[PDB]
Structures are given as C-alpha cells and as structure tokens.
Amino acid sequence: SMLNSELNTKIVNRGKEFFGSIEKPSLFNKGAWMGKAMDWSMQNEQFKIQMFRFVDVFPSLTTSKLLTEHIREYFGNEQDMPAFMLNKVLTSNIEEMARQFIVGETTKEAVKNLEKLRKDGFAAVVDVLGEATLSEEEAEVYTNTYLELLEALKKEQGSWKGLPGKGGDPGLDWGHAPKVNIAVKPTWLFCLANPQDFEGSVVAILDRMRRIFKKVMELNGFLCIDMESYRHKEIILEVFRRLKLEYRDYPHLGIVLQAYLKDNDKDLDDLLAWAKEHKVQISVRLVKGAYWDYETVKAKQNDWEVPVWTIKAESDAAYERQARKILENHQICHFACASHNIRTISAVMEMARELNVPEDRYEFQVLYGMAEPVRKGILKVAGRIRLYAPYGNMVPGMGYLVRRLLENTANESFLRQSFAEDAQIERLLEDPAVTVERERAARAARKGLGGLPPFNNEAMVDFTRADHRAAFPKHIAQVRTQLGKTYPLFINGKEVRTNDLIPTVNPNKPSEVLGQICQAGTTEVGDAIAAAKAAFPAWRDTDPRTRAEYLLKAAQAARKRLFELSAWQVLEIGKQWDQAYADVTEAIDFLEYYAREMIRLGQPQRVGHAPGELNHYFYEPKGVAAVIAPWNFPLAISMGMASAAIVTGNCVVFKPSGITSIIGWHLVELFREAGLPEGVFNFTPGRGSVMGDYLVDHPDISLIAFTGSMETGLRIIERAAKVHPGQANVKKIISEMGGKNAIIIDDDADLDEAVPHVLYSAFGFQGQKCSACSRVIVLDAVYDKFIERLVSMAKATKVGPSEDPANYMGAVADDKAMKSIKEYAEIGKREGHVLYESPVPAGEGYFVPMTIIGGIKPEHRIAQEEIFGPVLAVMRAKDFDQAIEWANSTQFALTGGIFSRSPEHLAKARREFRVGNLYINRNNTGALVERQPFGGARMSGVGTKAGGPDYLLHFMDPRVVTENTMRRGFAPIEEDDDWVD
Amino acid sequence: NSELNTKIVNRGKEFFGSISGEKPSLFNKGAWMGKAMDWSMQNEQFKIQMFRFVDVFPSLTTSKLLTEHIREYFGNEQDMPAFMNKVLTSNIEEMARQFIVGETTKEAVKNLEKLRKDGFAAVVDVLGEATLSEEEAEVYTNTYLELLEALKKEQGSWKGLPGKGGDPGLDWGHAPKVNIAVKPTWLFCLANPQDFEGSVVAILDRMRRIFKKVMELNGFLCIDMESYRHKEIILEVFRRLKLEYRDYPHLGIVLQAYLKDNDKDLDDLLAWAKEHKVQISVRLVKGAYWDYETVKAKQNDWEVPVWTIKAESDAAYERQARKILENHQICHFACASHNIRTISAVMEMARELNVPEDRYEFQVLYGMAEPVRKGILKVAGRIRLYAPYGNMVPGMGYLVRRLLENTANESFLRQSFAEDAQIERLLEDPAVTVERERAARARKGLGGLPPFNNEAMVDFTRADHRAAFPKHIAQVRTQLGKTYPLFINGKEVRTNDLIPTVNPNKPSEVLGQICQAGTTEVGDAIAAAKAAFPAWRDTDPRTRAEYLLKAAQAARKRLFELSAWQVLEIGKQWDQAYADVTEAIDFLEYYAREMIRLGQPQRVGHAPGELNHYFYEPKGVAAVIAPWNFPLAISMGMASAAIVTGNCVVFKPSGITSIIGWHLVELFREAGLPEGVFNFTPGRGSVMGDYLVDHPDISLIAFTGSMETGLRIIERAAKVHPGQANVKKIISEMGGKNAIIIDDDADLDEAVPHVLYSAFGFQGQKCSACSRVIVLDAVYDKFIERLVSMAKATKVGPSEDPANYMGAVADDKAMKSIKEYAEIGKREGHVLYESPVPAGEGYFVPMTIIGGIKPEHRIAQEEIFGPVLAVMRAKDFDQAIEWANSTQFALTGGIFSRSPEHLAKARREFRVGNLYINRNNTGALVERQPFGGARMSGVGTKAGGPDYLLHFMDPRVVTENTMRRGFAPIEEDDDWVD
C-alpha cells in the first residue's frame, strides 16, 4: 500500500544511516587468526565442516596424543593445511576465540566484567554456561550457580549508578529497568524434560525456576525464561504462565518467543490474550530462533510438519510482523528486540515511532562478543542496549563458540552478507515481505511409481500436540471397555473355537486379565495348513499388483486405528506409549514398503540381448509359510513376516506368541478388513509342546519365518532341513535370533549425547529388544566420568506401569522372563560389581530393577548370553583396539553403536565392528524400514534384512522362460536386441 | 565407370517403361494375397501373425486345431481385417500353389511343358521336409531320379527354345533342356562341419548318384548353396564332383554375394578351375538366409558373415558378376535376381565385354516378379524359372520364405511395387548407395570394462578350428602320467593315497594319478583359507574382480588346450569340451562385473542428518564340491563366485575329473591369487566328505550333484557345532527329470533334432538333459518314427573322433548303473531304439529310446544321467502338462508348440527353473539363461544370473548421525527444503 511504502522508506533510510555510520565485526577481521579461519570456512564448505567439528570435539582432547592425532585426522599433515595453520597454534587460538563470547569463567570474574560493561554504557542479561543436565545433581549445580550469581550481584548492585536515561529513577537503568537481569534455560533444570510426560516435566522445571525466581524478586531483578527446541516449547510456555500467575503483580518476568516458528503468530496472539484475560502484564524477548537446522532435520526424520519457516526472509518478515503486534500491545507487553540484523532493528525503531511507544516499553539486545558496529550504533542511536552475557566453564564455552561460529558464517546470515559478501545495501535493507514473495515465486517455477506415492515412513507420535498427549489415556480407557473376550482360531475365513484356553494378562498388573486365547491342537494346525495349501494356487496366480493392493488396504486399516492398536500393546505386553505407537507405525511401514517392493519385483524382466531369443527372468512363490512371531514387537514383526510371505504369493499359517495373542488377532482383523481371500492367512496360537514341531516338520510347509531366541531358531533350522515324504521343497528359513549388542564409548565421545542414548538403548522397553544395548564398552580414560553420569541419569528415572507416561520402563513380559532375568542379574552381580539397582513398585507386576553392573569382561556370562532384560554390563577397555576386539567377542552380530569423533576410529569401526546394523553417534535401537534394513549373520540370523530391498526375494524362487522367436528364418526385432542397424 | 553406369540406368529406365505399371500378383491389391500382404506390410504385428500362421497351417490337420489356431492368431471375426474359415484355408492353399509347378512328378512335367510354350526354360527343385534320416535322404534322392526318368522320356519331343544361333536341339541353341537344382544338406541328415570329411562324403555319394542320371540325359545339375554353416562343405562337394567328371560341362554351383567371403571364394574357385583346366558354372545370387545368419552370429559372438547394409550386397553382386563375365571362357553365368538394376547391370556389362550369349542366362523364381520375368523374356530372351514341385507341407514353408522375401523392407520388389519408390533411387549405382549409407552410420560397460558378452563358441566353419582339436589332443598325450598333488596355502602337498584317472572311451589310457586328502589335509586347507580370509575380505572388490579377469584371460589363451583335456578325461565331444571352457570364462567375466556392481556401498533412505549405507560382507570359508559333467565350467563358476565375494575356498573336484580341477590351480596361480584363497583338495568322500561339510569353520557349501548327496549335505550342514561362527549357507543344484512336450502343431523338423541333442548330447550326462519326451497322441507315431530314424543315423564312439554323436559315459560305475536303468525301462515300456556300440574297451552305453512310458514308471521319475530317453504318449495337452509336472524335480523343460494358448499355459504352469520354447532344453548361457531350480532340483539359486553373488554374502548397514552441535552436512539426495 501507499502507507506501506512510506514507512519502508523511513526504515531503509534509517538502515542506510546505520551503515553509513559504520568497519567490520572482529569475527570478519581477516587480519586476526579467527577472521582468517572463518574466511576460509566461508569459502570452502569442506574446511568449514572440518574446523567446526574440530572445535566441537576440542574440549575432549585432554592428552597430547589425543590432540595431535585429531589435528592430523581433521586437517591432514602440514602440507595440506591452510596458510594460517600445531598443538599450540590451534589451542591458544581456539581458546581465545571462545573467550570472545563469554564474560568470564567464574562468578567473581563475570561480575567484575559485567561492571566494566556498565561503565561502557551496556546493560546485561547474564546466562550460566553448562554441559547438558543429565541428572538431578547436575540440575542442582546449575540452579545453585544462578543462586550464587544472584547473591554476588545483590551485594554489588546498590553501588551501581543506573545507566543514563531521559527521566525516571536514577537508581534504575535508563530510569526504569532493573539492573539485575538473568536468563535461564528451562530444560537445564530437569534431565528428563519430555512432553511425553508433560505435567511431570512442567512441575520439575517450575519448582527449580521458582527457587531462582524468588531470589530474583528479593533483588528486585528481572528473570527471562529462554526458549529452546520445539520439543519443549509448550512445556516452557506453561512454566512461564504458571510462574507468572503465582506472582501476578511482579512485573520483571520475561519469556522468549521465536519468530522462525510457524506457530509463533498464534502463540503470541494466545499469550497476549491470556495476559489480558488474567489481567497481568508480560515481557517478551522476540528472537528469530537458534535451532533452525535441527528443527528441519528432526521433523524430516519423523515425517512431521517442519515447524520452522524454511525461507530465511520468512523469519525476517515474521519478526517484523510480530514485533509490530507486541509494540501495538505495549501497555500489556514489554518488548526486548533481540537481533543483530540492521534491517530488523531499523524496522523496530520506526514502528516504535509510528506507534508512539514509550521508551520504557522496549529495549534492544545483542549477544556479547558479536556485531560490535551494530551494537555501537544501537547504543548511539537508541541508547538502551543489553548484552546477553554467558559465563562459566570452557567445556560448554566451546560448544557455545561453535554455535556462534555457525551463526556468523551461515550463508543466510545478515552479518555475513553485510561484512563478508559485500552485499548490495538496497537488497540488505529490503522489506523482507518483498524478499519472501520473490523467493516463493522462484520456487514455484522424489517421484513414485505406478501412480503410488513413493515410500515414506509413517509419522511418529508427536507429543508436542495436545491431542496426541490426550489420545493414550483415552484409548487405554476405551480398550479396557472391551476386555474379557475369548479369541478363537481363524482358519479358512472362519472362527474356530477350542476348549483349551490360555489367559493373557497385563504384565504390569497381572490381576488384570485381558482375554482368553483358544489353543490349536495338531488337528487344527493341520486344517490351517490344508486351507493355506488349498488357497495357494489361486493366490499364486493373483496379479502381484493386486496382492500388493491388499497390503495397502491393510496399511490404511491400521493407520485409521493407530492409537487404538497402540493402547492394546501398552496393556498386553507393557509397551510405553512411544514404544507402542512405534510398533504400529513399523507394521504400517512394512505393509507400505512390501507392497511397493512386490510391484517393483512382480514384472518379468528381459535378460540377455541376443536377437532371435527372449529370456524373461521372474519370481515364483513357494507355498505354505509357517510364521512364528515374537512377543516383543507383537504387531511390527508379526505383520512384517506375514505380509512379506503373503504379498509374494505364499499363504501363511501364523503362530503368535502365547503372551501377545490379542495383538496377533489384530492381524486377523486387519487382513479381514482388507478383504484378503480365505485361507491366505490363518491364525493358530497353540502350545509349542503340543504343535510346535508338528508345524515346523509338516511336509506341506515350504518356508518358515521366525524371530525369537537363538536356541529355538537353531532347533527350527535343524528340524526344517529334513525333507519328509511328500515334501515338495527344501524348506527356506528366514530367521532372526537376537544379539549381545555393544556400544563403544571412545575417549573423545560427546558424553552429553552418549549417556542418554546408552540409557535408552539399554532400558527402552526394559531391554526387551534383540537390538538392545546390553554391553557398553568404555575407553579407560573416560570410564569414571561416563559411568558417574550414566548412573546419575539412571537414578533420575522411575520404574513402573507403562500406561503411566512418567515411568521410563516397567514390568518385563511375564513371570518366566522375570525369573530368568533375575537369575541373570544375580549371576552378573557375582561376575562384576553392581553400579545401580533401581527401586521397583511394591505389589504385583513382573518388575525387574533397572540394573547396571560394572567390571564385566568378555569371559563373563553376562558379557556373552542374551538376557533380554534391563541388565546392562559395563566393560572397561584399555585402548581402542581392545574396545573393538571386545565388541567382536560374542557369538552374535546384530547391532552395535559407537560414540566417537575420531575419523580414524570411526573408519576402523565401519570396517571391523561387523554387526548387521552399526550406528555412529546415536542409539543402536529403533531401526526404520528402508533407512535401516535390519538383521545379521553369525548366531544373530541367516543374513535376511527385513525392511530392505533384498528381503522379498527370500520368500520366492527365480524362474526363467527362454523362447526361440525365429520361424522360417525370421524373428520379430525387439527393442533391446543386439542388432546391426 | 560413369559411362557404363549411365547405360545401366537407361537400360533400367526402359525396363520400367516396358512393364507398363503392371504389379506382380503379390502386390495386386485386387487379389486376396495382395490384400493380405498389403496389410502385413502396413502392420508389423499382423505380418507376424499371418506369416507365423502360414508356417503352422500344414500341421492344422483337424477341424478343432484349425478353428482354435485361427482364433488364437487372428482373434474373433470382428477383430479381423476386412479382407479376412473355409475362405482362409482355400486362400492360403491357393497362395502356395502360386509358387509351385506341381504336386506330382507327372503334373510338374506337364506344367513345365506349358512354361516352354510360353518361352520359359526351367530349373526344377524337389520340395521336402527337412531330411532327418537316411531313409528321408533316399526318398529325396529317388524323387530326383524319378523326375529325371520322366524328363528323359519327354525332352526329345520338346522343340528347343528359340535362339540366335547354335544347335537347334538345345535351348536358345546351347542350353540343355533338363536343368535341376539339389539342396546338398537334404542329402545327409547329420551334415555338420564338425565332421567335415564325413559330411562331404555322404552328400557327395548321393549327389554323384543324381549327377550320373543327369549326365545320362545330357542335363544340367546345379548344386544350391545353403546356410554359412555348410558353405565350405558344399564348395568341397562341388569341387570333388567336378574333378570326377572334369569333361562334363553342365554342372553348376550357387555363390552368395551377400557373404563377405564371396569375393575371395569366387576368386579362389576361378583360380582353382584354371589350375585344374576345367570349366564351371556359377548361379550368382545375393542370398536367402540373411536374417538367420545375422541372428546366429550374434547369438554366438561370431563375426556376421553377411554384409549388413543391403546396398553392399547389391554392390558385391555387380562387382562379382563383372568378375564372372570377364572370365566367361572358364565360367558360365546364371544371373539369379529379380532386381531391375542388378539385371540391367549384368546386361550392360555383358554387352560391353562382348560376352557370348551362350555364357550367360537369367533366372527368377517361379510365381513371383511376373512383370520382371516378362521384361527379361522381351529384352534378353533367355529366362529360366526356378520351379519347385511336391508336397504341400514343405510347400507351405517355401511360401512363407517367398512372402518374407517379397515384403522385406529392403526388398527391391516391395520398394518398386508397394512403396512407389523413385526410379532414380531404385536404379542408382549401389556403390554410391553404399557410400551414402556408410556415411550415415558414422551397449556400454562400466568403469573402463567392456560390457559382458559371452565368449565366442568354437566355429568349425574355420579350417584352423577344425585342425586345432587333433593337434591339441596330441599335445595333451605328451603330458600324461603326472601325479597331481593337493594345493594348500600356495604349496603342493603330496599324500600316498593315489587314484588313477583314465580315458572313459579307452580305460587302458591312464591320464594321471591324483593324490587324495585325508581329514588332516582337509583340516589344513580349511585352516589356511580361514587364515587368508581377513586380508582377502579386506581386499577392495575391484581388486578381487581383477583376479577373475586375469584368470579368464589365462583360460582364453589356453582354450583349445583346456578343451582337449576334457575330451580325454571325461569324454566330452569337441564342441561340448570347448563350450565347457567358454562357460568357465563367462562365469569369470560375469562374476567379476557383478562384484564390481555390488561392491560399492549404496546410500539407503533420504532423511537428512543421517547417512545409511547398505553393502555386503563375505562369510568365511566356503566348501566347493564340484561335479564331473561340467568339470571346468561349474567348478570355476562356484569357486570364482565364492572367491570374488571375499570368501576363501576349499575345493573338492570330482574324483574322475581331478586333472580338470587342477586347471583351477593353474588358472588362479597364473592370475596371482593370494595363497590360501583357493585350495585344491580332491579326496575320498568316504574318508573326508562329512568332515568337510561338518567342520565348524565352514560357513558356506556350494554343491552341484545328485539329489541324495545334496539333501544329505543340507541335513548335516544345518547343525551348529561348538565354535561354528555362522549358520551354514547352502548353494545347491541337484539335477532333474526334464521333459520336452511335443504339441500337435509342433514343427517336427525342429523338434526331432532338438530332442535328440537334448537327450543324447554328451551322452545325456547333464542335469538339464531331456530324459522324458511327452508327445501328443495325434503326432506320436510320426514323431517317434522320425526321431528313431534320425537316431539310427548317429554313431556311438570315442569323443576324440568328431564323427561320433556321443560316446562312453563317465566311468564303470555309471555304465553299470545306466545299463541297469535301461533294463528296468525295457520292462516298463517298450524298446524303440538301442544303438550299436564299439567292440572292446570303453564305458559304452547304447543310445537308447524307450516308448510307452507313464508317470508311474521308475524311468519316468528317477534321474538316470545317461543316454536313456523315455517317450510318453499324452492323450491331450492338459495331460501333457500334468505329466510334465509329475516328478519331484523342476530344473529344465521344453515345449515345441505354435499355439499361443498352449505356450501361455506352459509359461504359467510348467514351473521348471528354465523353460525353453521351440528349442533344446540344454545349453544355458551366462546372463541369457541363469540356471537352477527349486523343488528337489535345488534351493532356488541361479548361477550365471544377477541374484547369484548375494548368496555368498550377507548384507550390512552402517547408520551415522551426522549432526554435531546443531548442524549437519547437506548430502546430495537429502530430503531437504530447497
């Protein structure tokens, strides 16, 4: 509009006067060493990656040997290094870089330097550096540091003259602002902060934030609650709202809001409306946001909507739009403009003039140590400028430095464009709404096959959503209205009841009987095999695209029942909410992936190129498949094995585990809803002592798909090898048989990541995963530090019923598992030494303590035998060679992990740590279809990888038809013929 | 010459002018044939339907067969072109009569006289189904004798065709009135340059009988030229018959200008005639087998023997016609062509060389190119019609060839009379056409390697290939008597248990002595392979593939030598031995390329912040237990596949082909393969067989052999013993009981020799061999008569003599086992044929055919692995399929059928691992026919195909979280936001 253009002219002219008054920030001073290192990082993305990852690992390089080797592995030798580049050249320069952005390493030093900044005319908001909070003790250390800082500031602020203002209180900064202002990171107050336990996380954080806030109010100071990643945004908003209402008359409490979030337009509207409704005032520090790359990656990894804008100008436009909304509401909402962008700052200054906002309702904030000319200009133009000033230990100071280097050298950074790229000032001061429309239009100007979308994994449950948080209590309650049923066999499209019933109960409350399961005798199993055999010829002759359609229909049937199917798993086998939902989404992924794989593999392909001849290569099913499924992934692996057999043209006789037979019945419901032909899927739970060998030995079985224990799998393999009278085929074995999986913790591991990932790998679903970490192999010189943090984090977690989301893990599968795991725990405590043994609930339930045992060596039984429970063995390796040797010292080879930031050690692990799925710098559990096709060799399996592009072939046999096309000396010319044209 | 070329173009222009727009009957769109060919020429799919229908038509001998084939080829009435049941039968029969001068000798003679009254001479040809026996050769021979006796009685009453001078009793004053053409291979059912001398003699002896009768009436005999396979044979028949009757002028030979060889062949033949002071006659043609020769050569990696630009054949024709005309004193000339440019060229060159008219005449095929025929009559006056006569069944096959000829895209007749091609282009000097076309002309590999191609088959059209086997067999006999040790960890290990290996066709000939490994030595070889495995596994896949490539080049340089060893050690025929070695080479070249393709880790998934790479790992030590019947091919295939995938091999060759097994030692050592990667441990199964299979350090077993042993291995290998690292992977091929179905509409000219070769090639010792031929009721009696009659022509004897079809079986144990099966089968069904065998030493089993066999019989179920063929009589096609599927095996199968419905039913329900349509069911090639089956024939692994190497490995995934401190590198295939 006309008015829009007139204000834009004022902003652009203010930005022009801003640039004209300024000279480069010190980070862009290419005379200094950090300016040279950053200049080459901005020209060479390969070097940027090396340098920034080096600074990240640098604080763990605690010996001369670690440091020298990492320097060579990251940067090469002295020949390949850049001109400005050893153990002294980098160490002093990197440490000097990190000190550029921190106001001190101790509280006393920080307070002295904060006083110096005041005499230069700058206010401050003080922040405490820290490694990630992984325990209650660490949360207390962080909390008590703020309390210590506030006590030091309390004794000094009385002697500080307020920064000069235009009027008001000469004891206050600019006449109105509190002299003491601190910022706190909420998740640093609770190591288990997680919206899966929303109330518990809010309360734990609020209780510590309240203790800090009371001290702040005694000082008449300001507390700002910082905003972190999207995972915790709603938690943090709720902490702010509760604390504000507890002290409704105290004005000096702020919250950060992130303009790069699509949610923020609504979140700001909501918070303003909420403050009006409750008749309180608030303060907002508006930022763009600090986690852009992380949010984009994390959402894409989980098929979630990306919560951030992804055109940089959209964040700039959102900031100016949201800053206007705050300034319009200045009577209720104090404003802190937190940006280094001259356009953004100039826009806020002119909007404040347009809206005639009193100066005591807005101030400007920049980070200590950067954008100095923008900082000096704000001081000279506005006069109210506060530095965000972190202080503390150099180890988290190094991580902070990396984030600042990333911020300043980003391709889209306003600072880089202004002071490194010689950008045109007109384009820099452009209305970002104009930039948005241009970038969108340019963008407006992976494919599937056969009209189907490409494969994508089904979205994980998203507990940032109120509706997802509410769904599990709702659907667990709805499931409890349908208990007590008798589940029959399902054979040839008919329900068949038998007189032999086995109850299935809640492992966390065994007095809760969920239903009764009919058991098949050998007669009923034989009927199921016969029905599968009779259905096989017409199913085999069904078009592969048509067979795949049944799987797609079953996938949509499960997708529509996702929370219901999950709730059943919570009760029948003690899955935690996330674990249950991930089991159902994996089942859906198998269906969607195997449908597409059969479509891909179902068309015959010409092979060879000789003329006068056509050879077509294609696949045939085998016949009847016995599918013997585990309880620990009761829908995922059951549906994967069964649907793979079915879509490739076989018919299935399915034995679910005797303790997850209701989940097994879900397969019946899903295939029935898909309209699958009768006999193609038959459901025969039964007693292995009655019908187990019968099923495996039967001459009409052509394939056995099994996931379970090594002892049972090896026995099945032995028995299936025999060809009985009337047996058409050599029986094909698809077998997955578990593991004894290790994670290696290298000297240079990032323990803030390694500790929580190891804890989840070991104790997620109380360790009942073939992929679970049961050995953590820790390098000698990091052992004591790692186990202290691991044990301290373990002590914060609670063991209890899985329907309660506050519990980390709960009861194991049944009484037999409990007895067997407890025996293994006693064996392990005699082999090594107990480091942690959790409390468990009193009363009923198959509870085994969360157990960590140290001093374990490869000779020990709990270093070799799969326990399948919450028992973690900690092993102390003398060097990295022994760590790999120990990792490889079992009969198994299923999964493994390594936390290391050494290129040489990672290369050695990739080559020699020969598990079927090796994970680098993350947990070794949670494989996804297509991304991590899953399975191993040695005693862990027969080298079949479910969820990958080699799997379906195992359910089939190849066939070739060769035709001589020549008649009377002529043959049709075919497209791919080798000919003479 | 430009002036000569202008005279030729003007001569052609007058020719087209004198034709007056007339079209040959095949291009007359007012007639039914013209409409059918018009639509065939506009619609390639209909051409295929109509031409294949005319081919199958003579076998549609019942009303049901006919009705069903019409519907299957053409659809229902609504789906048919307008010009289109009894109407179809009569129109096709009328088409065939257009090209045939009669059905009986008396009718042919009467119609040849009518031709004379219209001014045309003739050369008479006898129609016949393919000669598949000596009796059929005698019928064909005696038909020419009968024709000549009839012509002898008539020719004296024929006034000679008018000429300008010479003898009034001869045609045009000089040509004999009786002129016949004979197809040499119709005189011998086993004509094959692999037995060059035997083929020449057999053909020559019958050709001489015909020639004597020809000379008795002062007639002309022309020896026609057939496919390139027999070209040198036929040239040699002509030269010998010429020299036996050096003074008799009226003997001709056909030469084909579409052959690259023909410039030299014509020159050689003229020089030969000058050297021997004889005269010759040449009927120069372009050639009748062009599509076949191009296909056959491409199928065998042979140089295509024909020019492949059509103008090159035209240019060769004019060049070679000039050469003949220049040599008219020695060489009489028949210009056999329907091409007005070609004809005009010959006319003008003869005029410019002043060639006497008695030294050249013109020939066309009866019933086609009618305006061309008439124009030659008018301008030249000396025009002879090639006139076949005889039975309608071969008459239909001849009709198809004529329809193909007339409607070809490059046909001069199609271009002139269907396509309205420009006259100036039609009459252009074809040398100018060649240059323009060659100018216009002016499959890839991966990583600097050429694409995979199968190694060329031995080519016995070449004198050097025919001479190589006797020379290399003799060299092998200078190498007999050696002791062959074990080969373990790069070292020779001798034991004191020696087993001789002898020639199965002459057991008194001892080829050598083979050391036997005990369990100690097998344990040592397993230990050596296990110790070599870590560094071999860590060797780059491209480097491992390089050892296979070097081994293939080492074998290629020794091809005839390696072949000769197999002739003597296991009784391979020359072709079978060479094919064994080329298949070994193919495995090496193919698996090298496959490992290069599979050796690179691939990114899987597309999520950012994450890299997943999917790749493969070897297993460890592989036991390789190889058969004697493909002793280099399958040994090298199984061993090289295990090796290239990063495993190490302990290899047990068969106890009766251990010298061939030692060739793997020689080849891998020449390639420089690291020690311990390949270990050679022949041994007694009763001493070390279970020990090798049971051993805990074995991770994979690759086996080809009997079902009984394969199933034993599968059972024992499933056990996991203390210290065993892996569940043992089985790669197993266990033989078959393979059937070929002969449908009612089968082309028996093709089916009979393909069944014979499938059943008796390498005396039936192939897992793929046809041991059951399932024949539809209504064609049973005719099929077995022709099969037995062909079998009777073949000879059983030593494989080093190429005259023998098959020879001795593998050893004394096999001979006794097979002979016992033959006796069992003779009590179940009824003997149809039992060949003679040589007297004296040798493990000979008669070539044996037994009829009346039913699925309940032992020899319809049990694999005999020898020259014993069961013939089964099925009452209908459903029963034929049911009987084909009635065994416990499912390895190979064949069907001869020209019914789309029956072929579709076979493709779906005849569920063998390798089904072959209208050809033999043996002889699978790498990549073209990946080989192997399920049921009791194997575990679904297919050697020579793109799924095979994965069976020697296990997959592995590395997943890396690439995010540090909130940032990750962006990778090319990331799902991102730009």
Ligand SMILES: Cc1cc2nc3c(=O)[nH]c(=O)nc-3n(C[C@H](O)[C@H](O)[C@H](O)COP(=O)(O)OP(=O)(O)OC[C@H]3O[C@@H](n4cnc5c(N)ncnc54)[C@H](O)[C@@H]3O)c2cc1C
């Ligand atoms: C009386 C007589 C007897 C014959 N006897 C025999 C015989 O015993 N053996 C024999 O092999 N043939 C024989 N032929 C020849 C054969 O049957 C064809 O009639 C003849 O080749 C057609 O040649 P053209 O000059 O009539 O027609 P055109 O249309 O001029 O020439 C067609 C010919 O060119 C050749 N040709 C087609 N495409 C290509 C290409 N892409 N590249 C290179 N060359 C190509 C083929 O030879 C084809 O037949 C005989 C022909 C006649 C008239």
